[PDB]
């Protein structure tokens, strides 16, 4: 009983430049190497990547965010490489003090640098979002990947932009640091009367656990019926095989209801997006509408 977690044999052919459709091939790179290592688990082929204008705008924008934090971390380390490595987790680029409110007027050494790093990150993600849409259009595919990535952007937007604005200060935003953003998270909960009483936090968790449950179930199922070419999900949608039937009937006989080879992917995208969707609402209502979720919880309203 071989289990199909790793391949027993790799086969390689000429590198794959991919489908064309309306893609501008001027903007695609050359294929990178193959990877035997990767090739045991998935595809061996690195590349080619498509880098148009939006890619470079995003990538340049995104490195500027990373270096902007990194330069502050060096300053804090007093430019000592040993200290930098020692305290890497303890460094933190914090937002402007409540004093400066929603003003872009605070000095570099007191959150002005946080605003710069944030502006770069805002450009980075939004350009990258435009890129997920446009790369799909060019291949004539649905925009599921862009509408799903929006759900994640929603929580990130609420945490560092929308909610800070509605509270009326940049100090309400998340510091760029490893241990410091953990503290922010812990401290956020305490100040709001414990997020376990925030009913949106509770659903957020249900979905985050459902995402783990459902991909365990889905993954395991496809591997169980990969002996009838189950992984070939599009041709099983177009023309149902014993793979799709045995997959469905496993679940019908276990728990009394089942999915289709297409329908399971609707369960999937929704289970996952509902994490960051309920998440964002929970955070957005925290400090704006509800002071204390324990207290709110007592009235239910």
């Amino acid at each position: 009983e071989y289990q199909n977690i790793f391949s027993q044999v790799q086969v390689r052919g000429p590198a794959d430049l991919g489908m064309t459709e309306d893609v501008n091939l001027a903007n695609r790179s050359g294929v990178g190497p193959f990877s035997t290592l990767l090739g045991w688990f998935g595809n061996a082929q690195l590349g080619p990547i498509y880098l148009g204008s939006l890619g470079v705008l995003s990538l340049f924008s995104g490195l500027m965010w990373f270096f902007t934090i990194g330069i502050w971390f060096w300053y804090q380390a007093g430019w000592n490489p040993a200290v930098f490595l020692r305290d890497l987790f303890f460094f933190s680029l914090e937002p402007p003090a409540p004093e400066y409110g929603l003003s872009f007027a605070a000095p570099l050494k007191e959150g002005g640098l946080w605003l710069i790093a944030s502006f770069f990150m805002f450009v980075a993600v939004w350009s990258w979002w435009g890129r997920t849409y446009l790369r799909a259009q060019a291949l004539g595919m649905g925009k599921h990947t862009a509408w799903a990535f929006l759900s994640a952007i929603w929580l990130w937007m609420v945490l560092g932009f929308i909610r800070p604005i509605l509270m009326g200060s940049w100090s309400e935003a998340v510091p760029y640091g490893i241990f410091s953003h953990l503290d922010w998270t812990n401290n956020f909960s305490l100040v709001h009367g414990n997020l376990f009483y925030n009913p949106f936090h509770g659903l957020s968790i249900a979905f985050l656990y459902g995402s783990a449950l459902l991909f365990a179930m889905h993954g395991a199922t496809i591997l169980a019926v990969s002996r009838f070419g189950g992984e070939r999900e599009l041709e099983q949608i177009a023309d149902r095989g014993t793979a799709a039937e045995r997959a469905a009937l496993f679940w019908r006989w276990t728990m009394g209801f089942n999915a289709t080879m297409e329908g399971i992917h609707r369960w999937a995208i929704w289970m996952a997006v509902l994490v960051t969707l309920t998440g964002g609402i929970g955070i957005l209502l925290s400090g704006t509408v509800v002071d204390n979720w324990y207290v709110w919880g007592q009235n239910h309203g």
């Binding site: 071989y2 390689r12 000429p14 794959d16 949106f200 949608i237 177009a238 609707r266």
Partner: protein, 240 residues
């Protein structure tokens, strides 16, 4: 207050979504039937969705689901009891008849095409220039059955071109003919390929393919069905 409105709103939305999702997952297998194949009276509280139509690429036309459902094959089973809910016993040889774990589906008797409308799955000898890049090369190894008898030798790998992975070994039998074995149902070892599902005497009865350089979705289902059926049905002849 704004938070209570938001959460009451959400639960209403979540209900409509669970309803939307359930009806979406009724586009195949429904409506439900009795064991005799007439439509069951109780269908559940969810209705059938309005049909949707996929346009299959490469001039293969359309699929519309939900649509009319028939097996388009005979089922060699008979009831073992006078009421619903009991097993149905194979009336013949379940491996030959293609029932239970040996079940296949009447899929299109065409091969899956890649994005460019070429065949997805070629023998590696007709795939320029696919080679084995890593792991043991199974080509030339003897194929042993669960009865620890040699049934044949591997003479090629059938490869997915666009996903670049091995999907079948082509096995030459005592008689000079070949068969395909799912890559997922064999253990490639240093010195042989081991097949747990089948004994040596059942390799002959693996369904054969009508063309030597392509395999159709129907043929795939028959081969894979037959091999998986072996786990239940060739159990008398399995050692350890």
């Amino acid at each position: 207050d704004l938070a209570s409105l938001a959460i009451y709103s959400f639960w209403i939305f979540l209900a409509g979504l669970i309803y939307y999702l359930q009806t979406e997952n009724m586009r195949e297998g429904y409506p439900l039937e009795n064991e005799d194949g007439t439509p069951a009276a109780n269908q559940g509280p969810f209705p059938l969705p309005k049909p949707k139509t996929f346009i299959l690429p490469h001039g293969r036309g359309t699929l519309t689901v939900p649509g009319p459902e028939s097996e388009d094959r005979p089922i060699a089973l008979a009831r073992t009891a006078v009421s619903e809910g009991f097993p149905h016993a194979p009336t013949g040889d379940p491996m030959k008849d293609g029932v239970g774990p040996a079940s296949w589906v009447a899929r299109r008797d065409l091969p899956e095409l890649d994005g460019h409308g070429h065949n997805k799955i070629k023998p590696m000898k007709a795939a320029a220039g696919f080679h084995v890049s890593a792991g043991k090369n199974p080509i030339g190894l003897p194929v042993r059955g669960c009865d620890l008898e040699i049934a044949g030798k591997v003479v090629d790998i059938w490869v997915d071109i666009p996903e670049q992975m091995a999907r079948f070994l082509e096995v030459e039998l005592k008689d000079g003919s070949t068969r395909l074995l799912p890559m997922q149902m064999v253990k490639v070892q240093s010195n042989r390929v081991h097949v747990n599902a089948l004994s040596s005497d059942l390799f002959a009865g693996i369904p054969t393919i009508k063309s030597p350089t392509e395999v159709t979705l129907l043929e795939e289902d028959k081969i894979c069905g037959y091999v998986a059926g072996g786990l239940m049905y060739a159990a008398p002849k399995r050692k350890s």
